[PDB]
Structure formats: structure tokens, C-alpha cells
Write a protein that binds this ligand. Structure first.
Ligand SMILES: Nc1nc2c(ncn2[C@@H]2O[C@H](COP(=O)(O)OP(=O)(O)OP(=O)(O)O)[C@@H](O)[C@H]2O)c(=O)[nH]1
Ligand SMILES: [Mg+2]
Lengths: 86, 435, 81, 74, 116, 534
RNA sequence: UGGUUUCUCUUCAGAUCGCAUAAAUCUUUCGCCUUUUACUAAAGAUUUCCGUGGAGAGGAACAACUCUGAGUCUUAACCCAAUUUUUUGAGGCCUUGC
């Protein structure tokens, strides 16, 4: 019916999980049939997705920037934070 | 809303109020004198709605005072402009065909009624008489087919929602057969000028440049002066005499002090329009007025020829785009002829205009004329050009006011009613009232 | 044709980074990007999984065997969708 | 769609082919199809030992092609 | 030496003869009178003197009722037919001199202009 | 008020582009410098009007003519001429979709204004010729073929007003194809007579010569029409289909393939059929069948006009049908991007004919590298007037380095040489302007390859000069002065009426001397002012 | 995410129109010329009249409607299994890090 399930989360900050187990967090700006994704201001995490880990929240973080991810290698997505206003 | 009254009410009011010598109506003797200050305005509307020699009878709405003091005609004559030009071209053709085919044309006597004759009453002399045949040229039922049903009505396609809106009669929407038929009915009043390159030095801005200086044009208007060791005659090669039209064509370079000068649009690309003769020939063909091409080249350039063993073939579901439709219909050459046509006839839809606002003979005095004509008509064409230039020059923009509506404030009062009457009856009323 | 694909074609002529399915990282000028994500690049720096670098003049990578691409931020300014 | 890979530029050039399984071969491009299956002539297997062995003219299925690199200038 | 101007005129068929008349009244020598392929207008290529070409466009469009249209470029220099130094020929003050002493007239005018 | 330069009032409603413009400026190979020339008035302005009408939506709709962008003056807007070479710059996409940056120099077409065309042609690395389809090759067409072949640029022509074949001449499709092929062959002949190079031959199969009627916004190359034909239909290779369209090539409906002779049964060409048959169908069904059978034609083309759009007159309705059928002006983008050497390649033949010294080991390689860094150099040639202001801005292009706002400037003149440093002097940039013709907008910096207006350097730039870094050990020459197609012949003697204001008159005379590129204002021994013109 | 002919009132619109074109007042020259009107023909400054457009309100309908074309639980059979995608060359093991 609605097709909205992806379009809803568009412009939002999104936590995307890759098939190797990486975590890509960026601004979800576009998708397609294959679920190839366009992620603005995107960083990569490896060790953790923090839920306020008292030791530290961030280890092996890398700044990537503007990322196009191929859908083949995507597993899943959840909402990480609201859209930046800019 | 105040509604229409029976037409006998104003008739018996004018009949009882005679020469105002009866004692019984003496209280209205004052009111009629006040109505004198509106008798110019009541004249204007009376002559604004004159009924058009293809018409036998026009019924106009009438705003009249309750005493019978005055009769205004409350109507603006909207006349849709292509139909108006076609109807006057019809009148032109019929009057030429009548003046050639009549043994003696007796002229009317111009004081038509004698000085001591009282004016004739409408209700007995004119009301019961069948009027006459009007002029109204006979139209071909096959060739003038989309026009013949409605061409000589007053406001022709008024109650048809497909061609105009409503009864205010303001916006018209015709079809291209209608515009084609109205265009070849009006050829006697139109021109054959496809582009305005004819009006190079003979147009509006050129005449403004002429009026700004002291120059006249040999076929153009003459005006009043707007301003009222260098040029040694032994230092100047007079090779070609300075022809006077250079001061219009290039105004800064050939004059000193060009004040209040106007620039000139000088060239349009020459519109090359082939007028077709007969519909036996197709819509667009190679006309024998056009020069042939006949390609010649010295050594063949190696233009790409993708040869055999390219194995590029089209799929099954592809075709040329519009191969189902024919190349041309019977209405294609007519529409191309309607592309290069004068300003009423070159369009599908527009907004209605007044009978006042449509100059039928304006294109005739705007062009320069062949010299074989007498002196009289040359002076007349020059003076009409001068009138056109003085109209175009001192045109300040319309200066948007607050609208005033005199006849809407008269019929909001209790002293005015409204009816619908024959134009001749209201004219007899206006003459009796002014007397 | 997909929205991301149009944005990829837009990056032709720009310097881009590509990671393969095997994690080799190729950075250089994107010459041609096909619809299926096949990528022709030039004057490459490649960073292997052990960390070592190399230099290549000309490469072409199959779309399927690409994990992702990093494009300039020059593009970020397709906001309609 | 049913597109060709844009490889005419690479025709009859010597190439270095990275295949899946950490496999690498080198040879001259002799042709291709829409699946990116290749014909490679004078092909040489670059064994993980470092040793290289001549295998002649071969077919590589596009499926298992990770990456190619030209050893020439195109 | 006198500068000449190359003039191309696009004109209808009777306007070709009109252009030929107007251009021949200015020491013309019409170069080419070829038709335009695929058009009923003709191209008239010609040379003209550049002292004779002050308003040739305006006169031409006046005489052809705005049908013919003319453009003019500079490309040429050739000899004035008059003797530039000739004390026998006396130049009239305002009257235009014929061809045998145009160079004498133009030299005397340019001499009186600045140099003396 | 002393403003007559027609309401700049800067409000562009371009779609999603502000930063993108300056982002494509910073790429230096994604920019194209095109100049546009015609014999007189051959539709160049209404062309660029349709291009900007593509560019700027929700405003920018013109009714019963526009021509504001290359016709922004008021004497210019009434004469019919474009008297100035008013530039414009936009971004607009390709058939694929990758939007390029176009700097359109929009030159005059009048013969006496070839100065403007020369000055635009020297700064742009590509020329685009406009020929009226109903006219053919003309005077200034041949003159600008000469001037374009001489000053070493790529050459491409675009045949305009192909509607006048249809609606005015009313030729058959085969005869109109013959006339278009005749125009293309005459262009190739005039190029082949002049150029000693041979790799500049233009043919519609190659893709450089286009066809574009411009009151109704038709613009197609063979690639563009094939892209339309393939976007409607299936998976046809539109490049390979576009390759086999122009020139003595027939479609055999049995073998479904393109041959050279094989159907000889009074068939038509591939171009004649596939191009000119549906185009004449659209034209004829608009001009003569709007009431009867036009929506039946529009439903066969996927064109959906509303109830209000169907009630138009024939000119706007024909333009609207051709806009909804042809869409964008991507064929022009094809013939530009595929055939104009964007100024990495463009640097070398330009710098080998502009610069005085040559290819030598200091200046030449730094020019041809054309990175936005190093020996800051430019070439300003046009001097565009502000409405009220005495100052009139310089217009040039950045070859090497960048230009920043407030960055000081050494203006090397033209009487300057290497050992004569008394002509040149030093100034500072007032403001940097990039213009959309009818609007102006500021930038903080301009990289290499881009066109730029400079404010504040106007005093030493009489007609030709170069811009360089101040007090820098970078010693170089000047670019060559402006070789012109015509030579200024007409001499006008000039003297004031009142002799009490000779300085103000000499001031304005110097200003108009700085404005026009071939105006020559001198004083002879008798003391009368002499103006030489074209 | 969805529907107009006529009448009146109010308000805002004349830097490219009303694709037509009148008269008046003032001030300055004039042009004739018994003086005043009535005028000649120009420039300028202002106004009146015949017309016009956009928006809003109300009235007079003499048009007819809500599983209807478009849905926030209905409705374009087609984005539904052979190398470039939504159907696995997988499978197995081991070492390093708090
Ligand atoms: N028939 C036809 N006329 C056109 C077309 N495009 C423009 N014109 C007209 O041709 C005349 C020339 O148009 P412009 O574009 O102003 O002239 P130009 O080609 O720019 O040349 P310049 O006047 O020197 O600037 C104008 O009157 C246009 O209305 C066209 O496609 N077909
Ligand atoms: Mg007295």
C-alpha cells in the first residue's frame, strides 16, 4: 500500500548494520529498489553501539562523510536521532 | 433586484405627458427641466447602440425616469471583433454589388420630416409595420457552413456556452474553421502585409522622431517645431546628398541636438509566407515560387556509414511516433494561413470589444498609397496619419480611478424603472424629450 | 533508474573512495560509473587489509563486488525526494 | 538494460585480474559479454607461492571477477 | 587608395532590379546575383565605395518598401581613378566632381582638413 | 534616477543551487565556456531565454516575447539588436543527468558589432554558430566562420528556426531535409576552405551540429531525439540508434535494420521519417487540428495538457506542446560537452596564440596545467557599465591561480613590456561579481577557468590588459592585442557646441573609448576630435 | 489527497494599454488679428467623461452530484525464483583484546 516505511525515516539520522557487522551512522537521504542507501555526514563504528558505556562510548570510530552503501551488504536499520535542521 | 417592466408603461407615460401643456402634470414641469442636464449623456448611449445595417430591429434595455422625463439606454455594444469585421466586409461587398447593379440610386432627403410636422407616434405608425429586408449577404451553405446559422444575429453566439460566456458577452472562444471563414469573409477590409518591414521609416516611432525634429516624411505627417570653422563648406565632401530619411533611420548620427528623440525598431526577419491557391494541391508541398536546392559538392566527405555486420536492428514494439495520424488534413493549410493574419484573426480566443473601439479603415490610412490617386486623397491620408500620431504620442496611461456607475446609481433610486424597447422607439422618445 | 545511481553518475570526474567486498580500499578519480555500479577509475591509491599501500594508474571494479563508495561532499547540496 | 560493460577501451591490452578466493591471473583481453564474462589470451596464473604458470587462452566468468587493473595505458 | 565595402542584400525578385538600380547609381559593379536555395528571395552580393555607402541601407529599404535588406562589411582597398596631383584641374566649391579627378578632389579636401 | 539597465533586483529561483554553482566552479574540468554567434538576429537571445526559462522555474515565464537576458539595456531592447555581448552563466543537466556549468557568451550578430563577438570569442574556448533554417549561410555567418577558424577554437553550428521550413516555407519533409543538408554542407565547405586542420569537420552523425527552433523550444540532436525515443520505448541503445540516423540511410521494415539503398521503392531516409515525420505531425495537428483531433495525438505522445492549457492561442500552445514533448535542452549540452575542450585541454592552443612569449619553461607549462594556484594571471577584455556608477566593471577569465575579494591587483597594461614597467600600476579588488545577465551575485573567490567581473580596477584597463599578482617576482609578458575581423574605416569629425566643457566631454569620450573594443578616439593636428568606427 | 451563470456593493489596480481614442483647466510661447468669447499648433502641468482588470462580500439559479475520479483498514491483472542484485561457495577451525 503506502510505500512510506522507508520514506518516513528519510532525512533522519539512522543506524545501519552491515553484513560484516559494521555500524554505519549517517543522515538517511535516499534509497532505491535494491536498498542502496545515501548517508550524509556518515561515521563508521566497529566495537560498540553505545548505550552509555561508563568506560567510553566510542572506540574505532571513523569519519567517512558522504556515503553510498550498496543494498546487497545491508542487513538492518533503526532510528538513531532526529534530522539535523540545516 | 429591480426587474424589467412591461414596455407599455413608459409608452403610456410618454403619451400622457404630451407637450407638457396639460395642467394635471404641472408638478412634473420642474423635473423635466432638471433632466435637461443629462440630455447629452442620454444622446450618447442612444447613438452608441445604433443598429448595424444587417439588422432589422434591435431591442435595447432602457433606464427611464418614472415621470417620463428622460430615457437612457443602459447598454454597452459588445460586438465580437472578428465577426464585426466580417460583417462590415459583407456590407462592403453588398454595397459595391448594389451600386454597380442599380439603374438609379435615389438619395434620401436629409431634412426627412418637415419643420412643422409633429413627430410620428411609434405605437401606431411603426409598431405594427413589418420592417424591411436588411442587407445581409447570401452565404454559401457548404463553403460558409460553420458561420451561416448565426452570422447576422445581433449578439450572434450569445446563449451558447461553448463559444462565449453567458449574457454579459465578454469572452469568445471560436474554432479554426470559424476563424478561417471569418477571415475570408473579411478580405475586402483587410491587408496583405505579412510582416511589418513595410513600416520601416513609416511607423509610430519614426513619426515621433520626425515630430521631435523639423523633418517631414514624403508620404507622412507634418508638424510644428518642438524647439520653437567646423562645418566649413570648403572642408566637406558632398559625395552623396544627405537624404533626409537618414535623420529618422539614424537620428543621433545625422543631426545636432536630438532632444526628445525616440528609438526605432528597424528590422524583423522577412516572413516568407506561401499563399496556397487551391485545396487540390496538398497542405505543404514544394511550391514553384521557391528556388530549388540542387546539392553539389566537390569530394565526398567521409560521413559515418555504419555498414553491414553492425547487427543493430530495432525491436518489435517500436515505430515512428505519429505514423497512425495522417500527414495533413483539410484544416492544416487554413490554420497555417491563420498564423499569418491580422490581430483579430490570428488567434483562437479573445475578449470582446465595443463597436466604438474597432477601427475598420485604420489599416488603410496607416500604409502608404500608390501615387496614381488624386491630390485630395493624398492630403487626406497625410492628415489621418497626423491624427494617428497625435493619438499615439500624447497617450498618458489610463490613470486608475474609483469606478462611478451613473446608471447603477440611477436605478438604485425609486425614480427610475427599466424596460426593453425597440431602438427606434427610444430614439423617438429621446427626440420628444429633448424638444 | 535509482536515485542513488544518478548521484553516483554525478560524481564522475571527482575523486572518490571505494571499498570492495574483500575490504581493499581504492581512492582516485572516478572516470566512468555504469548503471550496475561497475566503476572505472584512475591514478589510484590502494590500501590493503594488512595496511600496506600501492599505486595504480588504471582500474575497473565490478559493481557487485563493491561494498560501498565515498563521494565528495560537493554533491550533498536531489533534496526533492 | 542487458547493458554491456564499458570495456572496449581495454580490448587487446594486458591486464591484471583479481579473482575471488584470493586468486590472481594476468593476460590480454580478447572479448566480453553483458555478464562480464571475459576471454583472456596468453593467461598466466600468479600462484600464492609467487611462481607463475602459463595457461594459454581462457574464459573467466564475470561472476567471480573482483577487480581488473590495466598493465598498459588506455 | 579608397576603401570599399562588401554588401549583401536579401531581396524579392522585382526588388533585385530595384537593388541593381540603386546600387548601380553609386558606382556599384554587382558581384553576384544568385538565388537562395530553398527560398524565393535572392542574395545580391556586391562591392560599393564607402563614401557612396552612407545610407545605402536606408535608401534601399525606402525604394523597396522595406522588402530588400542590406548589410555591409569592410574588406577592400583599391585606387581612386583620379589623378591625385594635378594642377590643371580646378575643383568647384560645392559641386560633386566626376570620376577623372576624384583623387584630386579628395586630396584637396583632406589637405584643407588638417594638414595645409 | 539614473538607472536604465532594467531592474537587476536579484532573486534567482533556480532549483536547489547556490553552493552547487561554486562547487562546480571548483572542478575546473566541469565548466564550459561557450560563445554564441549569428549573422544578425537569428534567434540567439530567445534561445538563451528558453535556456534560462529551463533554468529558473516558478517565475521566468515570458509571454509574447522576452529577450531580457542578452538585451538588458533600453536602446538595445527597442532597436532589436543585441548591442552588448552580455554574458550569462547557469547550471543545467545532460541526458545522463550530471549537471555541468555553462558560461554562455551571448554575442551580437550585426556586422558593425563584430568587436563584441571577437572579445567574447577570445575568452571562450568554444564557439556555437546559429544559422536560420530558412536563410542558409549568410554574410556574418561566413565572417564569424573566418574569425573562429583563425583564433583556434572548436567549431560547432546549430541550425535554428526549423519551424520556418514547416510553417512559412511549407516545404515537404524530404525537401526540407535537402535544405538542412545543404546548409550543413555549406558550413563544411566554408570550414574546409579556411582551416588547414582537418579534425574539425562537422556532421549530424558526429553529434556537434544540432537542430533547434527557438520560439517554440524545440532542441534536438540525434542523440537527444534518440534518448526521447528510447525513454518512451524499450531498451534501445540510443547512442547506437542515434549513430544511424542522418544521411542516405533507410529503414527496412522487414529486416528491421538500417541500410544504404536496399528499399528503393520510393522510401524516405531514416532522418526524414523518424525526425521530420512526427515533428510535422505535432506541428500540423497543433496549427490546424486543435479542436478536432489534437488530444488523440497528445494521448499517443504521453502529453497531458490541462483544461486551461488547451485554451491558448496557437503560438503559446505550440510552444507548450513542444516543451512537454522535448523537455530539456540536453542536445545542446551534448554538442557542448562532447565537442568543447573544457579548459584543461583548452589552455594550450589558447595560450599559444594569446601569450606573447610562448611555450617556454616558466609561463607556458604553468598556464597549461591550469591548476587554481601559482602564477595568478587573467585576461580582461570587456568593460561593462553599471547603471548610475562612473565605475564600469572589468570582465575576464582566471587562467592560473584564483581571485579573492580584497586581494590586491597589478594591472599590466598594453604599452607595458618586460623592460618597461611604467605603464602598469597596482590596485585592489572592490568586489567580485558573477552575473546571471539580469541579476548579479557576489562570490568570495573565483578559481581558474571561470569568468568574472572585477570592481575597482577600471582606471588602467583601457581596452586590453592583463591581471596579475602585485609586487611579485613572476615577471611575464602581456597577451596579444585584439586582432579584429574588420578594420575601423569610418572617420567622424567631432567638436563640442559650447567650448566651456572640454574636460567632461573628453572624460565621457574616454569612457566610451574604454567601452567599445574598436572605437578609436584621437586628436589630429588641426585640433578636431576624430572617432573611427566600423 | 475533489465542483459556476447573472445583479449590486466595497477595495486595490494603469512604467509598455482601452491593439481604441475625446473634451476641459492652468502656465508659457504663439498664430491670425477692431475688443471678449469661440479658435490656430506646440511644449509642459493637471483634471473630467466614455470604457477596462484583480480580489472580497451578499443576493437572484433558471446547473447538479457524493462506494465518486484521487483514500490514513477497496480498486492498475505486472518491481514476485538461472552469472549484477529479493533466495548464499557454503562449510569447518583457531589465535589476539578488558
Ligand atoms: N520564426 C521564428 N522566429 C524566431 C525564432 N526565434 C526567434 N525568432 C525571432 O527572430 C528575431 C530575432 O530574435 P533575437 O534572438 O532577438 O535575435 P538574435 O538572433 O539574438 O540576434 P540579435 O538581434 O543580434 O541579438 C526576433 O524577432 C525573434 O522573435 C524561431 O524559432 N522561429
Ligand atoms: Mg469695452
Amino acid at each position: 500500500g503506502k510505500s512510506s516505511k522507508m520514506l518516513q525515516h528519510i532525512d533522519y539520522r539512522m543506524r545501519c548494520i552491515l553484513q560484516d557487522g559494521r555500524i554505519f551512522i549517517g543522515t538517511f537521504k535516499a534509497f532505491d529498489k535494491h536498498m542502496n542507501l545515501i548517508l550524509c555526514d556518515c561515521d563508521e563504528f566497529r566495537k560498540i553501539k553505545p548505550k552509555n558505556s561508563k568506560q567510553a562510548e566510542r572506540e574505532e570510530k571513523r569519519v567517512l562523510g558522504l556515503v553510498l552503501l550498496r543494498g546487497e551488504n545491508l542487513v538492518s536499520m533503526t532510528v538513531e536521532g532526529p534530522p539535523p535542521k540545516d | 433586484q429591480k426587474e424589467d417592466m412591461p414596455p407599455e408603461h413608459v409608452r403610456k407615460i410618454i403619451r400622457d405627458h404630451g407637450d407638457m401643456t396639460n395642467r394635471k402634470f404641472r408638478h412634473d414641469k420642474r423635473v423635466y427641466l432638471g433632466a435637461l442636464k443629462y440630455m447629452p449623456h442620454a444622446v450618447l448611449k442612444l447613438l452608441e447602440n445604433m443598429p448595424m445595417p444587417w439588422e432589422q430591429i434591435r431591442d435595447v434595455p432602457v433606464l427611464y425616469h418614472i415621470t417620463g422625463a428622460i430615457s437612457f439606454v443602459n447598454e454597452i455594444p459588445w460586438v465580437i471583433e472578428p465577426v464585426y469585421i466580417s460583417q462590415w466586409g459583407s456590407m462592403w461587398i453588398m454595397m459595391r454589388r448594389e451600386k454597380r447593379d442599380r439603374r438609379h440610386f435615389k438619395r434620401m432627403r436629409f431634412p426627412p420630416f418637415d419643420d412643422e410636422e409633429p413627430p410620428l407616434d411609434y405605437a401606431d405608425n411603426i409598431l405594427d409595420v413589418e420592417p424591411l429586408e436588411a442587407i445581409q449577404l447570401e452565404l454559401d451553405p457548404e463553403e460558409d457552413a460553420p458561420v451561416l446559422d448565426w452570422f447576422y444575429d445581433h449578439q450572434p453566439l450569445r446563449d451558447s456556452r461553448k463559444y462565449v460566456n453567458g449574457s454579459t458577452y465578454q469572452r469568445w472562444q471560436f474554432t479554426l474553421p470559424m476563424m478561417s471563414t471569418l477571415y475570408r469573409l473579411a478580405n475586402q477590409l483587410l491587408t496583405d502585409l505579412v510582416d511589418d518591414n513595410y513600416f520601416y521609416l513609416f511607423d509610430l516611432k519614426a513619426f515621433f522622431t520626425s515630430k521631435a525634429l523639423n523633418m517631414a516624411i514624403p508620404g507622412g505627417p507634418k508638424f510644428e517645431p518642438l524647439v520653437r570653422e567646423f562645418n566649413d563648406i570648403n572642408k566637406i565632401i558632398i559625395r552623396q546628398p544627405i537624404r533626409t530619411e537618414y535623420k529618422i533611420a539614424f537620428p543621433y548620427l545625422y543631426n545636432n541636438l536630438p532632444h526628445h528623440v525616440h528609438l526605432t525598431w528597424y528590422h524583423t526577419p522577412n516572413v516568407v509566407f506561401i499563399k496556397t491557391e487551391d485545396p487540390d494541391l496538398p497542405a505543404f508541398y514544394f511550391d514553384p515560387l521557391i528556388n530549388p536546392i540542387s546539392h553539389r559538392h566537390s569530394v565526398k566527405s567521409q560521413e559515418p556509414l555504419p555498414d553491414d555486420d553492425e547487427e543493430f536492428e530495432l525491436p518489435e514494439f517500436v515505430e515512428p511516433f505519429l505514423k497512425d495520424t495522417p500527414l495533413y488534413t483539410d484544416n492544416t493549410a487554413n490554420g497555417i494561413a491563420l498564423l499569418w493574419a491580422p490581430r483579430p484573426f490570428n488567434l483562437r480566443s479573445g475578449r470582446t470589444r465595443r463597436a466604438l473601439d474597432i477601427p475598420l479603415v485604420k489599416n488603410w490610412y496607416r500604409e502608404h498609397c500608390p501615387a496614381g490617386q488624386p491630390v485630395k486623397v493624398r492630403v487626406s491620408y497625410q492628415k489621418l496619419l497626423k491624427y494617428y500620431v497625435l493619438n499615439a504620442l500624447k497617450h498618458r496611461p489610463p490613470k486608475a480611478q474609483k469606478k462611478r456607475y451613473l446608471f447603477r446609481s440611477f436605478k438604485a433610486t425609486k425614480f427610475f424603472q427599466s424596460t426593453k424597447l425597440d431602438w427606434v422607439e427610444v430614439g423617438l422618445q429621446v427626440c420628444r424629450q429633448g424638444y | 533508474i535509482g536515485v542513488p545511481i544518478k548521484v553516483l553518475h554525478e560524481a564522475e570526474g571527482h575523486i572518490v573512495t571505494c571499498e570492495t567486498n574483500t575490504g581493499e580500499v581504492y581512492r582516485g578519480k572516478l572516470i566512468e560509473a555504469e548503471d550496475n555500479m561497475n566503476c572505472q577509475m584512475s591514478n589510484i591509491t590502494v590500501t590493503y587489509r594488512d595496511g600496506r599501500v600501492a599505486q595504480l594508474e588504471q582500474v575497473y571494479i565490478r559493481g557487485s563486488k563493491i561494498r560501498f563508495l565515498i563521494l565528495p561532499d560537493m554533491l550533498k547540496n536531489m533534496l526533492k525526494s | 538494460k542487458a547493458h554491456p560493460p564499458e570495456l572496449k577501451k581495454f580490448m587487446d591490452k594486458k591486464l591484471s585480474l583479481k579473482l575471488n578466493g584470493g586468486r590472481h591471473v594476468q593476460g590480454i583481453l580478447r572479448g566480453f559479454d553483458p555478464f562480464m564474462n571475459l576471454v583472456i589470451d596468453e593467461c598466466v596464473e600468479m600462484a600464492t607461492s609467487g611462481q607463475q604458470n602459463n595457461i594459454g587462452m581462457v574464459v573467466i566468468r564475470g561472476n567471480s571477477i573482483i577487480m581488473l587493473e590495466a598493465l598498459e595505458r588506455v | 587608395m579608397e576603401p570599399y565595402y562588401f554588401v549583401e542584400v536579401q531581396a524579392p525578385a522585382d526588388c533585385v532590379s530595384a537593388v541593381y538600380t540603386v546600387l548601380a547609381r553609386r558606382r556599384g559593379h554587382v558581384t553576384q546575383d544568385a538565388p537562395i536555395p530553398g527560398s524565393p528571395l535572392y542574395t545580391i552580393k556586391a562591392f560599393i565605395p564607402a563614401i557612396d555607402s552612407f545610407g545605402f541601407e536606408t535608401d534601399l529599404r525606402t525604394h523597396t518598401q522595406g522588402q530588400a535588406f542590406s548589410l555591409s562589411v569592410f574588406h577592400h582597398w583599391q585606387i581612386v581613378p583620379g589623378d591625385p596631383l594635378d594642377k590643371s584641374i580646378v575643383i568647384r566649391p560645392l559641386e560633386p566632381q566626376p570620376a577623372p579627378h576624384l583623387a584630386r578632389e579628395f586630396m584637396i579636401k583632406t589637405r584643407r582638413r588638417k594638414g595645409l | 534616477t539614473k538607472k536604465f539597465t532594467l531592474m537587476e533586483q536579484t532573486l534567482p529561483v533556480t532549483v536547489y543551487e547556490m553552493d552547487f554553482l561554486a562547487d562546480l566552479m571548483d572542478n575546473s574540468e566541469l565548466i564550459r565556456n561557450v560563445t554564441l554567434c549569428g549573422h544578425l538576429h537569428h534567434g540567439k537571445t530567445c534561445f538563451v531565454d528558453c535556456l534560462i526559462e529551463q533554468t529558473h522555474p516558478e517565475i521566468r515565464k515570458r509571454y509574447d516575447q522576452d529577450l531580457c537576458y542578452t538585451d538588458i539595456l533600453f536602446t538595445e531592447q527597442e532597436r532589436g539588436v543585441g548591442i552588448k555581448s552580455t554574458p550569462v552563466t547557469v547550471v543545467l543537466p545532460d541526458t545522463k543527468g550530471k549537471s555541468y556549468l555553462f558560461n554562455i557568451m551571448d554575442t551580437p550578430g550585426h556586422v558593425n558589432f563584430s568587436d563584441e563577438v571577437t572579445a567574447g570569442l577570445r575568452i571562450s574556448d568554444g564557439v556555437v554558430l546559429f544559422i536560420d533554417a530558412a536563410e542558409g549561410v549568410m554574410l556574418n555567418t561566413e565572417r564569424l566562420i573566418k574569425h573562429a577558424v583563425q583564433e583556434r577554437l572548436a567549431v560547432t553550428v546549430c541550425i535554428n528556426k526549423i519551424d520556418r521550413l514547416i510553417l512559412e516555407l511549407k516545404l515537404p519533409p524530404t525537401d526540407a531535409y535537402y535544405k538542412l543538408r545543404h546548409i550543413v554542407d555549406e558550413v563544411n565547405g566554408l570550414i574546409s576552405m579556411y582551416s588547414t586542420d582537418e579534425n574539425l569537420i562537422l556532421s549530424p552523425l558526429l553529434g556537434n551540429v544540432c537542430f533547434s527552433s527557438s520560439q517554440y523550444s524545440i532542441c534536438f540532436t540525434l542523440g537527444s531525439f534518440a534518448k526521447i525515443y528510447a525513454d518512451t520505448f524499450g531498451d534501445i541503445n540510443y547512442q547506437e540508434f542515434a549513430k544511424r540516423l542522418w544521411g542516405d540511410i533507410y529503414f527496412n521494415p522487414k529486416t528491421r535494420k538500417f541500410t544504404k539503398k536496399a528499399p528503393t521503392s520510393s522510401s524516405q531516409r531514416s532522418f526524414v521519417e523518424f525526425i521530420l515525420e512526427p515533428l510535422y505531425k505535432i506541428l500540423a495537428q497543433v496549427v490546424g487540428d486543435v479542436d478536432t483531433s489534437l488530444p488523440r495525438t497528445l494521448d499517443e505522445l504521453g502529453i497531458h495538457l490541462t483544461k486551461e492549457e488547451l485554451k491558448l492561442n496557437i503560438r503559446p500552445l505550440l510552444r507548450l506542446v513542444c516543451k512537454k514533448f522535448f523537455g530539456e535542452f540536453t542536445g545542446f549540452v551534448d554538442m557542448c560537452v562532447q565537442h568543447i575542450p573544457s579548459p584543461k585541454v583548452g589552455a594550450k592552443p589558447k595560450i599559444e596564440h594569446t601569450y606573447t612569449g610562448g611555450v617556454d619553461s616558466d609561463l607556458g607549462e604553468a598556464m597549461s596545467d591550469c591548476d587554481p594556484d601559482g602564477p595568478l594571471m587573467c585576461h580582461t577584455t570587456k568593460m561593462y557599465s553599471t547603471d548610475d556608477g562612473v565605475q564600469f566593471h572589468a570582465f575576464g577569465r582566471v587562467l592560473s591561480g584564483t581571485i579573492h575579494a580584497g586581494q590586491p591587483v597589478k594591472v599590466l597594461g598594453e604599452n607595458y613590456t618586460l623592460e618597461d614597467e611604467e605603464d602598469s600600476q597596482i590596485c585592489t579588488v572592490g568586489r567580485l561579481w558573477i552575473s546571471v545577465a539580469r541579476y548579479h551575485i557576489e562570490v568570495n573567490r573565483v578559481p581558474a577557468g571561470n569568468w568574472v567581473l572585477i570592481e575597482g580596477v577600471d582606471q588602467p584597463i583601457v581596452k586590453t590588459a592583463t591581471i596579475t599578482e602585485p609586487r611579485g617576482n613572476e615577471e611575464a609578458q602581456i597577451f596579444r592585442p585584439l586582432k579584429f575581423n574588420t578594420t575601423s574605416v569610418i572617420k567622424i569629425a567631432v567638436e563640442p557646441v559650447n567650448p566651456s566643457e572640454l574636460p567632461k566631454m573628453l572624460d565621457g569620450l574616454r569612457k566610451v573609448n574604454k567601452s567599445y573594443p574598436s572605437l578609436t578616439t584621437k586628436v589630429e593636428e588641426s585640433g578636431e576630435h576624430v572617432i573611427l568606427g566600423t
